[PDB]
Design an enzyme around this catalytic site. Structure first.
Site, mmCIF file in Angstrom:
data_model
loop_
_atom_site.group_PDB
_atom_site.id
_atom_site.type_symbol
_atom_site.label_atom_id
_atom_site.label_comp_id
_atom_site.label_asym_id
_atom_site.label_seq_id
_atom_site.Cartn_x
_atom_site.Cartn_y
_atom_site.Cartn_z
ATOM 1 N N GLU A 40 0.841 -1.199 0.000
ATOM 2 C CA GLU A 40 0.000 0.000 0.000
ATOM 3 C C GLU A 40 0.874 1.245 0.000
ATOM 4 O O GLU A 40 0.569 2.226 -0.674
ATOM 5 C CB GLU A 40 -0.912 0.016 1.239
ATOM 6 N N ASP A 44 0.732 3.716 -3.119
ATOM 7 C CA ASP A 44 0.403 5.106 -2.959
ATOM 8 C C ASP A 44 1.355 6.033 -3.752
ATOM 9 O O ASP A 44 0.934 6.999 -4.392
ATOM 10 C CB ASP A 44 0.473 5.485 -1.480
ATOM 11 N N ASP A 113 -6.919 1.124 0.529
ATOM 12 C CA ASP A 113 -5.590 0.553 0.775
ATOM 13 C C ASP A 113 -5.315 -0.636 -0.153
ATOM 14 O O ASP A 113 -4.200 -0.756 -0.700
ATOM 15 C CB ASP A 113 -5.430 0.064 2.219
ATOM 16 N N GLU A 116 -4.539 0.401 -3.745
ATOM 17 C CA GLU A 116 -3.186 0.896 -3.785
ATOM 18 C C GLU A 116 -2.206 -0.252 -3.743
ATOM 19 O O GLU A 116 -1.232 -0.225 -4.469
ATOM 20 C CB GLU A 116 -2.891 1.849 -2.634
#
Lengths: 144, 147
Positions: A40, A44, A113, A116
């Site tokens: 994650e 991101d 999450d 990502e």
């Protein structure tokens, strides 16, 4: 993982290492010392570059414009949860019985999450350019 | 620009389009409607991924660790101003007479923004993996870890 093939069809990406995808779909409550938190973190940053780059080119001939605001609107928890729900991620995320009972499958933070983490995993296995094309398609399809 | 070849050797990258490097080096005070602000925006994101990825692999075996905080320590203004000075970017940045008289060549935010725009320029011209290699090299040269 059952029906995982359907997630791959929705993304238009089939993982060479299926355990990498499973890793990305593993919420922190599920299993000790094995979860998507790190994927994650990477995902991101990947999406920040995918979106920042897309905005740099699309708004190039326009001195006016806050690309930072435009990016924030596209990569926030609410938008990512919407993309994730379009992929039915809630059906694929591995989490504890208690976390499901606590409504974990529709928590936007959990959904966001996991999306990502999937993008970070594609970046690791296939590279940035490939992850970019997958992410841009998901963004296009959800925010025309 | 004069001595541009020296900056390209410090970076270990030669631009196909010299004007793109010039653009990355152009401070907002220099010329109307032409500066490195957009390239800084792009480079900052490139650097966030390059460092994020470096950290992801480096600490893959540590269950303990706030990678977000460690990244900030690596990509903040002060760290980038230092990398920028090891490239002598202050000698290359284009800025107005007044900005240069106000100590612009040594302002850490100006130095930092120029570094980022340059990495952003490289990514744009040569792709991410190439920008990565250049960036990781610059970070390792200025902040070697122990090891």
């Amino acid at each position: 993982m059952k029906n995982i093939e359907k997630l791959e069809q929705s993304l238009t990406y089939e993982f060479k290492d299926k355990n990498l995808l499973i890793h990305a779909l593993t919420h922190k409550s599920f299993k000790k010392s094995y979860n998507n938190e790190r994927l994650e973190f990477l995902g991101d940053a990947v999406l920040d570059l995918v979106v920042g780059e897309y905005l740099f080119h699309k708004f190039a001939k326009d001195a006016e414009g806050d690309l930072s605001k435009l990016r924030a609107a596209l990569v926030n928890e609410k938008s990512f949860a919407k993309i994730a729900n379009s992929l039915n991620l809630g059906d694929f995320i591995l989490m504890s019985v208690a976390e499901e009972n606590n409504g974990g499958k529709e928590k936007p933070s959990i959904l966001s999450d996991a999306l990502e983490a999937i993008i970070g995993a594609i970046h690791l296995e296939a590279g940035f350019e490939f992850a970019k094309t997958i992410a841009l398609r998901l963004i296009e399809k959800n925010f025309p």
